Amino acid sequence: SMLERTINLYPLTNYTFGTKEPLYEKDSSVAARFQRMREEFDKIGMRRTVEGVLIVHEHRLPHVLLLQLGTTFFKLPGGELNPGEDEVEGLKRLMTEILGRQDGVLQDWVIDDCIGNWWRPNFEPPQYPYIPAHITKPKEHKKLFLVQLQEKALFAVPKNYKLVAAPLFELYDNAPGYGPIISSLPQLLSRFNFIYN
Amino acid sequence: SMLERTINLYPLTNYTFGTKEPLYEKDSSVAARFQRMREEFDKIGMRRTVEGVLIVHEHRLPHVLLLQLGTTFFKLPGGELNPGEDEVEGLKRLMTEILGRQDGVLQDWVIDDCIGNWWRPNFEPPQYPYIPAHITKPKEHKKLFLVQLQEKALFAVPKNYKLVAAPLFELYDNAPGYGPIISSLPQLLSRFNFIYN
Ligand SMILES: [Zn+2]
Ligand SMILES: [Zn+2]
Ligand SMILES: [Zn+2]
Ligand SMILES: [Zn+2]
Asked: Which tissues is this protein detected in according to the database (chains A, B)?
């Protein structure tokens, strides 16, 4: 009766948050966003997204690193795979593009754990942790991975974002604030045995 | 990039649901329930509970087996560990007592996966997927395990309960109906690769 995965956490002050040039979104509006999803659905089929959950602690409390676009939406580091691209190689590529260093030193990402699957049935905001009834052609499939951080690292945050450390209690039961994927991270992380280093 | 645990599911019509004698709760009221939790906290410290998530399918849709007490509360099969009792040996004991056969043939339970941890800070209903801020002496610790069923089995359901098969969509976003632990099973099960046999 020890069936829990053991995960090392490190103090938030072990990490350095530098800056770099703005990184802009592919879509300048919700309307544009759902227009491009329709155009690519017809060319290459279901959109495949990957997202990384990076965890630290301070005074032995776990926090999730979220990206805040200006003072607007909160999001996980991640993005869209290319057709034929490996899910894990793709998440590493995407996290290097977002938080990789201005001095071009190669970050060592460790990804060994799936934590969830979400599905978007239509060209619309709703997403579910299962393929809903009667849906044969889902429009997006999103996969969440736990990213084990090294003891220390330097991250370069695009100047148009802030990297914030959110305690679990602030996420919990807070879908209006964060939406249904980030609001359910406390439940999804409860199975891990965290070591507070 | 295959980091998902693979789980075999079987059709609900593969299983037989027999009956047996009523099984009564230790507490005849909420008030009694929280009174006994206080008395045992003082004698043996934090209550340790274990709960099992049993999954089937029909026409390739996953369903969770829930116990319904009369036409009142829904609950997972499980209960309270004794002091010094192994969590997994204890869940097997508890599931044999609840659903074990009237003919005394030994059910083979397979338990290889933790899916969650919940904590009760006070002698009161609220439970959280983490130890909340300022809480040093939690009053209950609850652990959820995925139970892999065999291809076929006969279960004996106490006459005061019904064993119901709930589709995920009915649980999803339905805390008022089911409470916060069962309502978040769809999120907690999304990481598995289910085989629909
Ligand atoms: Zn400290
Ligand atoms: Zn899919
Ligand atoms: Zn069928
Ligand atoms: Zn505990």
From this structure: Expressed in the heart, brain, placenta, lung, liver, skeletal muscle, kidney and pancreas.
Please count the other Cβ atoms lying within 10 Å of the Cβ belonging to residue B158.
18
In this structure, are residues B10 and B62 in contact, taking their beta carbons and an 8 Å threshold? no
Sequence-distant (≥ 6) Cβ neighbours of residue A36 within 8 angstroms = A26, A27
Q: Rounded distance, CA A38 to CA B66, Å?
A: 40
- Kindly identify which residue of chain A lies nearest to residue B5, measuring between CA atoms: A114
The two structure tokens encoding residue B68: 């319904």
Nearest-Cα residue of chain A relative to residue B115:
A191
Q: For the purposes of burial, counting CB atoms within 10 Å of the CB of A59, is it exposed (0-12), middle (13-18) or buried (19 or more)?
A: exposed
Position A148, amino acid: Q
Question: Rounded to an integer, what distance in angstroms lies between the CA atom of residue A93 and that of residue B71?
Answer: 52
Return residues 113-172 of B near A (CB < 8 Å): 113-118, 128-130, 132-133, 145, 168-169, 172
DSSP string, A99-133: H--TT------EEEEEEEEEEE-SSSS--BSS--T
Contact B75, B86 (CB under 8 A): no
Q: What angle do CA B19, B21, B27 make, to 5 degrees?
A: 120
Cβ contacts of A120-124, under 8 Å, gap ≥ 24: A120/A47, A123/A34, A123/A37, A123/A38, A123/A41, A124/A34
Q: What is the resolution of this structure in A?
A: 2.0
Domain boundaries, chain A: 5-197
Query: What is the C-alpha separation between B98 and A140, in angstroms, rounded?
Result: 41
Q: Which CATH architecture has domain B5-197?
A: Alpha-Beta Complex (3.90)
